[PDB]
Amino acid sequence: GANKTVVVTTILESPYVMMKKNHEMLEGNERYEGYCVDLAAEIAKHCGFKYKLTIVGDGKYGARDADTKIWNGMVGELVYGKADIAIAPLTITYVREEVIDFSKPFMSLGISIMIKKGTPIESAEDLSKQTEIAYGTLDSGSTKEFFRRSKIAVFDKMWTYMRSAEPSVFVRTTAEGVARVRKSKGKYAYLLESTMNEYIEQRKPCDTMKVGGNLDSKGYGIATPKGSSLGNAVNLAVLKLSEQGLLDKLKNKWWYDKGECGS
Amino acid sequence: GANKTVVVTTILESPYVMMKKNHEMLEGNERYEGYCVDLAAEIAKHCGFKYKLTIVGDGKYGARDADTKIWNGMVGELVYGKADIAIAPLTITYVREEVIDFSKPFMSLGISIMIKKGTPIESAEDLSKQTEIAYGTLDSGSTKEFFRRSKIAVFDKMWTYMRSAEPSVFVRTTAEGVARVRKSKGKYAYLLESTMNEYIEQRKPCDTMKVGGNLDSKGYGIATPKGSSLGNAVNLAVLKLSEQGLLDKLKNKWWYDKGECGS
Ligand SMILES: C[C@@H]1CCCN(C(=O)c2ccc3nccnc3c2)C1
Ligand SMILES: C[C@H]1CCCN(C(=O)c2ccc3nccnc3c2)C1
Ligand SMILES: C[C@H]1CCCN(C(=O)c2ccc3nccnc3c2)C1
Ligand SMILES: C[C@H]1CCCN(C(=O)c2ccc3nccnc3c2)C1
Ligand SMILES: C[C@H]1CCCN(C(=O)c2ccc3nccnc3c2)C1
Ligand SMILES: N[C@@H](CCC(=O)O)C(=O)O
Ligand SMILES: N[C@@H](CCC(=O)O)C(=O)O
């Protein structure tokens, strides 16, 4: 039938989606800026659709409750028909791939460690062998699931510690984890994706850093409900933008060009 | 109908597929070893199929002739029904995605520069601004297409030079490009994927090196003919092997564990 405005679910996560200067006085998509705001515009252009950006109601990426079997976050919004597409730093994972469709990836990342500068930690193994410095992950996302599921000895040991630590080491948003690192005088380290870690490293007050190699290697993809007719065109659009160098230009624009911690 | 042996197309490209010690006396899949031989076994196991490894007849990755519109290489073998799946360092590209199906990627790479140690080149821009050192790419693959298509000034300048250089700067196989670098006393640099570059850097006589950052960022995928029923299971298998850490273990096994240029 007739063309319809595509509902895009996304998440307020710097620098992917941020509230634009003077947003309270603005309406619709003009309220937002960031890597994924730019990426949504480019995809829409190449695919020939109009769209409305919406911020995911529960502020989550997406996990399936083992009791109720219900998905939350952006994944849930796709699964239950509340959005047509997710354009966000949404990690391609096995359990998600079973229930939604994903484009080829538009950005690579791995789990990484964020420390307050000077903290004597260089690796996951270092974290796992000490008790002076607490550490945790985001709730309802792929990093927490990575630890929950890992059979790798070091990561399994870390999960056994994290899942039972009191007070809780988990946070609801990336911003909360970053704030916890910054205020904890070296006594909290945060496990988060390299992309977000490297962004924060270039933001004032320039008091955090990424340490060690990444723990894994994966990608973010644009997601649609399983079988959605939008999927094929969106996937080709990602590959076209990749090949044109536009994704590289956007990463540079939002990570480094406006970095606040020097050249 | 009844289960049938899956024909796998692949390419003799170290360390993805190599001839095993004493192969002349061996038969079938036992003739071969390497990253993709191991990966094929793992995928077959998870997907529940028997398979026969075959080396692509024309020794090419795959390009579409602009005159005849016919695809060659592994892509052609899928497109014309000569193989059921390609398990190889086959780059996911837009023009390929239009004609075959790809899994999510199993390995990341970017175009990179290989030099003979001591060659005074640090970047693509360096290459583009000098005439002492020739440089080229592999035929019938994604690297040559990258330059042919690029609108980025430096890469367009490099293509204008390469496409008309005499004698030809292009090679038929990666091994030929590597040999050309090694024998040319610094006067030839080779543009090839970071994965192959980093492998060769750890092989005797340890006379080459990767210089500069990568020129782009992309992935290899497992390919099937468009619409093949095998695609869904194979894609989940890649994600499962990724998440289990098996792909990382295999990269380490074939690149670094048996590296010949020190620890
Ligand atoms: C199993 C794979 C290991 C390698 C990384 N990966 C990816 O899915 C991946 C690979 C390459 C990419 N290039 C550009 C943007 N996103 C990318 C994501 C997972
Ligand atoms: C073993 C470590 C426990 C945590 C504290 N340590 C640090 O190095 C450390 C690291 C960062 C800091 N930032 C502000 C104030 N104090 C700090 C102390 C030692
Ligand atoms: C060194 C570890 C060996 C295994 C048993 N351990 C723990 O349960 C343990 C206890 C408290 C911690 N607090 C912060 C970070 N990690 C911790 C690990 C300590
Ligand atoms: C400007 C360069 C042109 C090419 C030669 N140059 C080199 O540094 C160079 C680099 C590597 C070599 N390997 C063996 C023998 N000679 C070599 C000379 C200078
Ligand atoms: C410095 C370049 C400016 C533009 C015009 N140039 C060429 O066509 C040019 C000619 C010969 C070359 N031989 C090896 C490598 N690159 C070359 C580039 C030289
Ligand atoms: N990108 C992650 C969220 C961040 C994290 O888990 O560290 C996801 O899609 O679940
Ligand atoms: N991986 C490339 C071949 C190597 C190259 O072009 O450098 C392809 O799939 O075409």
XYZ file of C-alpha atoms and ligand atoms in Angstrom:
641
model
C 0.000 0.000 0.000
C 0.886 3.676 0.351
C 4.257 4.814 1.642
C 4.292 5.182 5.407
C 6.669 6.924 7.765
C 9.180 4.442 9.138
C 9.402 4.344 12.939
C 13.036 4.184 14.025
C 13.898 3.026 17.505
C 17.197 4.248 18.892
C 18.805 4.986 22.263
C 20.237 8.070 23.933
C 23.876 7.065 23.986
C 26.685 9.491 23.210
C 27.833 10.161 20.557
C 25.360 7.991 18.617
C 22.271 9.951 19.659
C 22.424 13.095 21.768
C 20.030 15.954 22.509
C 20.827 18.883 20.237
C 21.465 22.399 21.520
C 18.088 24.083 22.182
C 16.193 20.806 21.641
C 13.422 21.749 24.059
C 12.325 24.338 21.468
C 12.678 21.930 18.540
C 10.429 19.138 17.276
C 10.677 15.680 15.739
C 13.994 14.528 14.357
C 15.565 17.970 14.793
C 15.764 17.373 18.552
C 18.626 14.914 18.068
C 22.168 14.763 16.712
C 24.923 12.234 16.499
C 26.454 9.388 14.545
C 23.252 7.383 14.315
C 21.150 10.486 13.542
C 23.450 11.104 10.582
C 23.444 7.394 9.662
C 19.618 7.258 9.767
C 19.456 10.206 7.341
C 21.874 8.528 4.938
C 20.094 5.187 5.048
C 16.703 6.863 4.565
C 18.059 8.771 1.586
C 19.415 5.661 -0.108
C 16.341 3.600 0.659
C 13.764 6.262 -0.223
C 11.795 6.435 3.034
C 10.630 9.097 5.481
C 11.236 8.324 9.141
C 10.593 9.340 12.727
C 13.310 8.900 15.331
C 11.990 7.613 18.655
C 13.948 6.910 21.820
C 13.361 3.425 23.174
C 10.842 3.611 25.988
C 12.722 1.588 28.570
C 16.188 2.968 27.712
C 17.599 -0.525 27.092
C 19.400 -2.380 24.284
C 17.573 -5.670 24.630
C 17.590 -8.890 26.585
C 15.151 -11.777 26.897
C 13.796 -12.485 30.372
C 14.461 -16.174 31.123
C 11.277 -16.418 33.224
C 8.729 -14.595 31.028
C 10.670 -15.027 27.765
C 9.796 -11.393 26.905
C 12.338 -9.174 25.126
C 12.951 -5.658 26.358
C 14.746 -2.659 24.918
C 15.108 -1.917 21.215
C 15.012 -5.603 20.409
C 11.603 -5.829 22.088
C 10.328 -2.827 20.180
C 11.136 -4.642 16.920
C 9.873 -8.030 18.089
C 6.494 -6.719 19.321
C 5.859 -4.405 16.373
C 6.433 -1.049 18.049
C 9.163 0.052 15.629
C 10.095 -0.709 12.025
C 13.897 -0.439 12.303
C 16.562 0.086 14.983
C 19.429 2.411 14.073
C 21.664 2.319 17.105
C 24.903 0.784 18.479
C 23.091 -2.546 18.630
C 25.427 -5.523 18.782
C 24.832 -8.452 16.407
C 24.522 -11.528 18.581
C 23.351 -15.102 18.126
C 20.257 -14.879 20.346
C 19.191 -11.620 18.705
C 19.808 -12.944 15.177
C 17.314 -15.711 15.967
C 14.495 -13.211 16.529
C 15.281 -10.095 14.412
C 17.085 -9.363 11.120
C 20.430 -7.512 11.030
C 22.298 -5.719 8.276
C 25.942 -6.464 7.753
C 27.799 -4.474 10.380
C 28.339 -0.744 10.142
C 30.931 -0.489 12.921
C 33.328 -2.879 14.653
C 33.919 -3.088 18.403
C 35.022 -5.320 21.239
C 34.452 -5.388 24.982
C 37.113 -3.290 26.715
C 38.122 -1.985 30.115
C 37.691 1.626 31.229
C 39.764 2.845 34.158
C 40.318 6.114 35.978
C 43.782 7.245 34.859
C 46.520 5.708 36.995
C 44.575 2.665 38.086
C 47.011 -0.297 38.170
C 45.076 -2.541 35.802
C 46.196 -3.584 32.318
C 43.958 -6.537 31.455
C 40.933 -8.629 32.294
C 43.280 -11.160 33.868
C 44.571 -8.387 36.206
C 40.982 -7.594 37.255
C 40.209 -11.258 37.902
C 43.178 -11.718 40.238
C 42.559 -8.847 42.660
C 40.004 -7.490 45.114
C 40.930 -3.803 45.506
C 39.014 -2.588 42.448
C 35.388 -3.452 41.716
C 34.109 -3.764 38.176
C 30.857 -4.252 36.312
C 28.886 -3.901 33.097
C 25.726 -2.419 31.648
C 22.394 -4.202 32.275
C 20.295 -5.701 29.484
C 22.982 -5.720 26.843
C 25.493 -7.867 25.060
C 28.419 -7.233 27.433
C 26.605 -8.655 30.431
C 25.490 -11.629 28.328
C 29.086 -12.176 27.160
C 30.232 -12.712 30.735
C 27.172 -14.727 31.727
C 27.834 -17.144 28.874
C 31.612 -17.312 28.646
C 33.377 -20.619 29.164
C 36.767 -18.874 29.079
C 38.265 -19.312 32.534
C 39.143 -15.688 33.261
C 35.799 -14.346 32.031
C 33.840 -17.046 33.914
C 35.681 -16.089 37.117
C 34.845 -12.432 36.497
C 31.159 -13.279 35.995
C 31.019 -15.348 39.184
C 32.358 -12.306 41.032
C 30.214 -9.674 39.296
C 26.884 -11.505 39.527
C 27.069 -11.692 43.320
C 28.995 -8.529 44.258
C 27.314 -6.251 46.794
C 26.679 -3.417 46.310
C 25.699 -4.161 42.734
C 28.406 -3.514 40.153
C 25.919 -3.257 37.280
C 24.608 0.008 35.876
C 21.509 1.027 33.950
C 23.178 3.297 31.414
C 26.671 3.827 30.031
C 26.697 7.347 31.512
C 26.143 5.845 34.976
C 29.083 3.469 34.529
C 31.346 6.286 33.367
C 30.323 8.459 36.301
C 31.049 5.564 38.664
C 34.582 5.188 37.247
C 35.234 8.917 37.491
C 34.079 9.257 41.108
C 35.495 6.077 42.577
C 39.156 7.157 43.000
C 40.387 4.119 41.080
C 38.192 1.604 42.916
C 35.786 0.902 40.029
C 36.564 -0.145 36.479
C 33.871 -0.432 33.833
C 33.527 -3.085 31.136
C 32.047 -1.500 28.010
C 32.396 -1.557 24.273
C 35.579 -0.132 22.789
C 33.594 2.360 20.726
C 32.028 4.011 23.752
C 35.304 3.733 25.731
C 37.308 5.478 23.014
C 34.703 8.236 22.733
C 34.723 8.944 26.470
C 38.537 8.935 26.481
C 38.388 12.067 24.299
C 35.870 13.912 26.505
C 36.618 16.314 29.351
C 37.785 15.967 32.033
C 40.047 13.496 30.242
C 40.347 11.360 33.354
C 39.593 7.918 31.902
C 41.375 5.545 29.631
C 40.943 2.334 27.720
C 43.387 -0.364 28.860
C 44.408 -3.698 27.405
C 43.246 -5.297 24.210
C 39.603 -5.948 23.522
C 38.150 -9.152 24.979
C 36.217 -9.983 21.813
C 35.552 -8.839 18.242
C 32.106 -8.102 16.826
C 29.881 -5.566 15.079
C 26.870 -3.309 15.302
C 24.079 -3.818 12.801
C 20.931 -2.109 11.689
C 18.024 -4.257 12.818
C 14.557 -4.892 11.456
C 11.760 -7.242 12.478
C 12.351 -10.722 11.109
C 11.286 -10.940 7.485
C 10.758 -7.184 7.093
C 10.838 -6.056 3.466
C 13.050 -3.117 4.541
C 15.976 -5.380 5.377
C 17.415 -6.008 1.920
C 17.598 -2.337 0.906
C 18.968 -1.265 4.279
C 21.708 -3.884 4.082
C 22.817 -2.719 0.641
C 22.757 0.858 1.890
C 25.164 -0.021 4.719
C 27.542 -1.666 2.266
C 27.324 1.323 -0.106
C 28.041 3.805 2.702
C 30.910 1.611 3.856
C 32.437 1.490 0.380
C 32.006 5.230 -0.174
C 33.983 5.919 3.007
C 31.006 7.638 4.626
C 30.978 5.443 7.724
C 34.652 6.291 8.311
C 33.920 9.986 7.881
C 31.084 9.796 10.378
C 33.202 7.982 12.971
C 35.843 10.651 12.644
C 33.265 13.421 12.848
C 31.748 12.186 16.115
C 34.759 10.679 17.943
C 37.839 12.639 17.047
C 37.057 15.844 15.164
C 35.272 17.206 18.223
C 37.478 15.496 20.821
C 38.132 17.659 23.899
C 41.433 16.196 25.123
C 43.841 17.602 22.549
C 44.878 16.835 18.977
C 15.095 -34.900 -0.619
C 17.980 -36.975 0.720
C 21.027 -35.388 2.306
C 23.713 -34.601 -0.240
C 27.380 -33.776 0.111
C 27.870 -30.021 0.083
C 30.376 -28.764 -2.495
C 32.611 -26.112 -0.951
C 34.544 -23.768 -3.177
C 37.674 -22.260 -1.683
C 41.036 -20.889 -2.827
C 44.658 -21.827 -2.232
C 45.705 -18.832 -0.184
C 47.951 -19.112 2.858
C 47.155 -19.632 5.668
C 43.454 -20.083 4.842
C 43.951 -23.144 2.638
C 47.321 -24.792 2.108
C 48.488 -28.173 0.816
C 49.170 -30.473 3.752
C 52.451 -32.326 4.225
C 52.403 -35.464 2.027
C 49.187 -34.356 0.278
C 50.096 -36.090 -2.975
C 49.514 -39.392 -1.137
C 46.291 -38.202 0.506
C 42.747 -37.870 -0.827
C 39.734 -35.586 -0.530
C 39.616 -33.076 2.286
C 42.718 -34.534 3.945
C 44.880 -32.934 1.244
C 44.337 -29.491 2.768
C 44.951 -27.575 5.987
C 44.492 -24.072 7.229
C 42.160 -21.566 8.824
C 39.344 -22.116 6.356
C 39.807 -25.914 6.395
C 39.297 -25.772 10.156
C 36.416 -23.288 9.783
C 34.687 -25.511 7.188
C 34.852 -28.457 9.615
C 33.344 -26.393 12.426
C 30.564 -24.988 10.272
C 29.761 -28.444 8.875
C 29.608 -29.841 12.394
C 27.204 -27.177 13.618
C 25.058 -27.332 10.512
C 24.967 -31.127 10.198
C 26.305 -31.568 6.658
C 29.008 -33.576 4.900
C 31.180 -31.625 2.485
C 33.844 -31.782 -0.195
C 36.481 -29.069 -0.399
C 37.255 -28.014 -3.968
C 39.755 -25.418 -5.135
C 38.229 -22.830 -7.436
C 39.040 -23.742 -11.015
C 40.315 -20.379 -12.184
C 42.160 -19.504 -8.945
C 40.241 -16.226 -8.552
C 38.085 -14.523 -5.904
C 35.469 -13.119 -8.241
C 34.765 -10.190 -10.503
C 32.101 -9.470 -13.103
C 33.313 -8.822 -16.642
C 31.831 -5.481 -17.760
C 31.618 -6.678 -21.383
C 30.171 -10.198 -20.977
C 28.658 -9.585 -17.523
C 29.942 -13.044 -16.478
C 31.291 -13.612 -12.956
C 34.526 -15.493 -12.463
C 36.240 -17.003 -9.451
C 34.455 -18.349 -6.385
C 31.624 -15.906 -6.892
C 31.046 -17.372 -10.357
C 31.082 -20.900 -9.005
C 28.212 -19.960 -6.669
C 26.322 -17.911 -9.251
C 26.414 -20.618 -11.957
C 25.639 -23.531 -9.640
C 29.047 -25.196 -9.532
C 29.376 -24.998 -5.741
C 26.987 -24.856 -2.789
C 29.037 -22.641 -0.444
C 32.293 -20.653 -0.470
C 34.416 -20.858 2.676
C 37.329 -18.581 1.951
C 38.729 -15.076 2.656
C 35.968 -13.688 0.456
C 35.283 -10.011 1.044
C 31.674 -8.866 1.535
C 31.055 -6.184 -1.056
C 28.038 -4.388 -2.478
C 28.229 -5.844 -6.000
C 28.690 -9.360 -4.629
C 25.863 -8.975 -2.092
C 23.557 -8.246 -5.034
C 24.195 -11.671 -6.572
C 25.089 -14.074 -3.703
C 24.211 -14.413 0.004
C 26.789 -13.748 2.749
C 26.942 -14.685 6.409
C 27.777 -12.037 8.939
C 31.537 -11.642 8.830
C 33.918 -14.132 10.378
C 37.039 -11.962 10.159
C 37.768 -8.244 9.828
C 40.339 -6.694 7.495
C 41.301 -3.585 5.585
C 43.434 -2.853 2.542
C 47.041 -2.290 3.619
C 50.501 -1.697 2.222
C 53.251 -4.323 2.148
C 56.831 -3.142 1.752
C 60.270 -4.716 1.722
C 61.791 -3.731 5.075
C 63.459 -0.323 4.914
C 61.425 1.030 2.040
C 60.751 4.740 2.745
C 56.967 4.556 2.550
C 54.566 5.055 5.460
C 51.188 5.624 3.805
C 49.091 5.541 0.671
C 49.608 9.289 0.380
C 53.409 8.677 0.324
C 52.969 6.173 -2.530
C 50.790 8.584 -4.501
C 53.353 11.393 -4.356
C 56.413 9.559 -5.685
C 57.696 7.661 -8.709
C 60.632 5.614 -7.369
C 58.535 2.695 -6.111
C 55.905 0.903 -8.182
C 52.841 -0.628 -6.589
C 49.875 -2.781 -7.512
C 47.121 -5.138 -6.415
C 45.675 -8.575 -7.030
C 43.493 -9.134 -10.128
C 39.819 -10.085 -9.925
C 39.298 -9.147 -6.313
C 37.946 -6.508 -4.011
C 41.187 -4.523 -3.621
C 41.446 -3.762 -7.315
C 37.752 -2.829 -7.367
C 38.269 -0.536 -4.355
C 40.774 1.550 -6.294
C 38.808 1.432 -9.539
C 35.767 2.839 -7.752
C 37.209 5.223 -5.185
C 36.302 8.894 -5.318
C 38.839 9.665 -2.576
C 41.483 11.861 -4.175
C 44.577 9.924 -3.122
C 43.105 6.538 -4.051
C 41.789 7.847 -7.401
C 45.282 9.154 -8.213
C 46.753 5.767 -7.309
C 44.254 3.989 -9.578
C 44.990 6.310 -12.500
C 48.659 5.395 -12.104
C 48.190 1.653 -11.539
C 45.722 1.023 -14.369
C 48.152 2.319 -16.990
C 51.568 1.425 -15.534
C 53.862 -0.593 -17.795
C 55.005 -3.211 -17.083
C 51.787 -4.249 -15.388
C 51.723 -3.775 -11.623
C 48.902 -6.285 -11.129
C 49.411 -9.891 -10.085
C 47.398 -13.080 -10.449
C 47.896 -14.430 -6.943
C 48.889 -13.056 -3.549
C 52.026 -15.232 -3.612
C 53.103 -13.509 -6.842
C 52.670 -10.068 -5.272
C 54.661 -11.079 -2.202
C 57.444 -12.505 -4.348
C 57.522 -9.268 -6.350
C 57.955 -7.209 -3.156
C 60.698 -9.496 -1.878
C 62.737 -9.462 -5.099
C 62.369 -5.836 -6.098
C 64.948 -4.266 -3.724
C 62.386 -1.793 -2.401
C 61.048 -0.779 -5.820
C 57.665 -2.534 -5.529
C 55.065 -2.261 -2.795
C 51.965 -4.434 -2.746
C 48.430 -3.427 -1.787
C 46.712 -6.370 -0.094
C 44.408 -7.143 2.766
C 45.746 -6.649 6.277
C 45.050 -10.279 7.138
C 47.327 -11.629 4.431
C 49.909 -8.863 5.078
C 50.117 -9.670 8.786
C 50.462 -13.387 8.054
C 53.332 -12.868 5.612
C 55.043 -10.513 8.078
C 55.485 -13.520 10.391
C 56.923 -15.825 7.701
C 60.582 -16.355 6.830
C 62.633 -14.642 5.590
C 60.965 -11.918 7.647
C 61.805 -9.298 5.047
C 58.409 -7.619 4.638
C 56.274 -5.395 6.752
C 52.867 -3.814 6.942
C 53.043 -0.004 6.976
C 50.506 2.686 7.752
C 46.929 2.273 8.823
C 44.449 0.325 6.766
C 42.774 2.201 3.907
C 39.343 0.754 4.669
C 37.430 -1.484 7.084
C 35.420 -4.537 6.055
C 34.849 -8.261 6.548
C 35.032 -11.718 5.057
C 31.845 -13.747 4.880
C 30.763 -17.252 4.096
C 28.873 -17.141 0.816
C 26.045 -19.178 -0.643
C 24.010 -18.880 -3.830
C 21.247 -16.322 -3.435
C 18.284 -17.814 -1.617
C 20.102 -21.022 -0.646
C 18.477 -22.806 2.288
C 21.973 -23.322 3.771
C 22.435 -19.621 4.455
C 20.450 -19.224 7.666
C 22.131 -22.104 9.516
C 25.594 -21.125 8.309
C 25.083 -17.559 9.505
C 24.063 -18.686 12.986
C 27.046 -21.022 13.047
C 29.420 -18.113 12.361
C 27.882 -16.112 15.190
C 28.083 -19.108 17.555
C 31.752 -19.727 16.713
C 32.438 -16.025 17.152
C 30.792 -15.954 20.575
C 32.538 -19.136 21.718
C 35.912 -17.553 20.936
C 36.686 -20.207 18.330
C 37.334 -17.748 15.509
C 39.883 -15.955 17.712
C 41.548 -19.254 18.560
C 41.780 -20.169 14.896
C 43.298 -16.811 13.931
C 45.910 -17.250 16.614
C 46.590 -20.826 15.559
C 47.271 -19.945 11.917
C 48.881 -16.477 12.160
C 50.884 -16.279 15.335
C 51.281 -19.647 17.046
C 53.305 -20.908 14.093
C 54.928 -17.573 13.212
C 58.549 -17.920 12.050
C 59.923 -14.473 12.921
C 60.196 -14.741 16.696
C 57.870 -14.521 19.691
C 33.389 -12.550 13.895
C 33.821 -11.165 13.402
C 35.277 -10.864 13.790
C 35.685 -9.576 13.105
C 34.732 -8.444 13.442
N 33.306 -8.774 13.255
C 32.371 -8.017 12.551
O 31.191 -8.323 12.421
C 32.778 -6.815 11.794
C 33.812 -7.020 10.866
C 34.247 -5.972 10.078
C 33.649 -4.727 10.126
N 34.124 -3.753 9.322
C 33.500 -2.558 9.431
C 32.435 -2.356 10.288
N 31.946 -3.325 11.103
C 32.569 -4.519 11.029
C 32.136 -5.579 11.837
C 32.926 -10.020 13.928
C 45.362 -0.442 43.790
C 44.637 0.837 43.373
C 43.299 0.956 44.108
C 42.578 2.245 43.716
C 43.461 3.472 43.934
N 44.729 3.294 43.227
C 45.161 4.161 42.224
O 46.228 4.008 41.627
C 44.390 5.345 41.826
C 43.982 5.516 40.503
C 43.267 6.667 40.168
C 42.991 7.651 41.138
N 42.293 8.762 40.805
C 42.048 9.660 41.791
C 42.473 9.456 43.089
N 43.174 8.356 43.456
C 43.424 7.457 42.476
C 44.130 6.314 42.790
C 45.476 2.097 43.647
C 41.397 -12.745 43.716
C 40.011 -13.374 43.555
C 40.102 -14.909 43.578
C 38.710 -15.541 43.581
C 37.883 -15.058 44.768
N 37.774 -13.599 44.737
C 36.516 -13.010 44.814
O 35.458 -13.625 44.918
C 36.415 -11.540 44.797
C 35.956 -10.891 45.942
C 35.859 -9.495 45.937
C 36.208 -8.758 44.809
N 36.097 -7.418 44.831
C 36.469 -6.746 43.716
C 36.909 -7.397 42.587
N 37.009 -8.742 42.535
C 36.657 -9.430 43.652
C 36.768 -10.818 43.659
C 39.061 -12.881 44.654
C 63.570 5.383 -2.350
C 63.761 3.876 -2.173
C 63.712 3.168 -3.529
C 63.926 1.664 -3.365
C 65.218 1.361 -2.608
N 65.218 2.077 -1.333
C 65.293 1.426 -0.102
O 65.290 2.030 0.972
C 65.417 -0.033 0.006
C 64.481 -0.775 0.726
C 64.651 -2.157 0.817
C 65.761 -2.787 0.221
N 65.916 -4.129 0.311
C 66.999 -4.672 -0.300
C 67.906 -3.902 -1.001
N 67.782 -2.557 -1.110
C 66.705 -2.009 -0.500
C 66.523 -0.643 -0.579
C 65.090 3.536 -1.475
C 54.182 12.015 -8.262
C 53.069 11.583 -9.220
C 52.182 12.781 -9.601
C 51.171 12.393 -10.681
C 51.868 11.854 -11.925
N 52.696 10.701 -11.573
C 52.544 9.513 -12.281
O 51.760 9.346 -13.212
C 53.392 8.360 -11.929
C 54.328 7.914 -12.861
C 55.140 6.821 -12.535
C 55.017 6.181 -11.306
N 55.806 5.128 -11.025
C 55.662 4.553 -9.807
C 54.726 4.994 -8.900
N 53.910 6.034 -9.169
C 54.054 6.634 -10.379
C 53.255 7.731 -10.695
C 53.660 10.939 -10.480
N 25.875 -2.584 22.185
C 25.379 -3.300 23.371
C 25.123 -2.353 24.559
C 26.377 -1.922 25.321
C 26.991 -3.014 26.166
O 26.344 -4.054 26.432
O 28.139 -2.800 26.608
C 24.112 -4.050 23.030
O 23.680 -4.016 21.855
O 23.533 -4.733 23.894
N 39.498 -10.969 -0.269
C 39.606 -10.418 -1.629
C 40.845 -10.947 -2.377
C 42.166 -10.286 -1.984
C 42.318 -8.868 -2.486
O 41.562 -8.424 -3.381
O 43.252 -8.199 -1.995
C 38.356 -10.736 -2.416
O 37.421 -11.351 -1.853
O 38.237 -10.350 -3.593
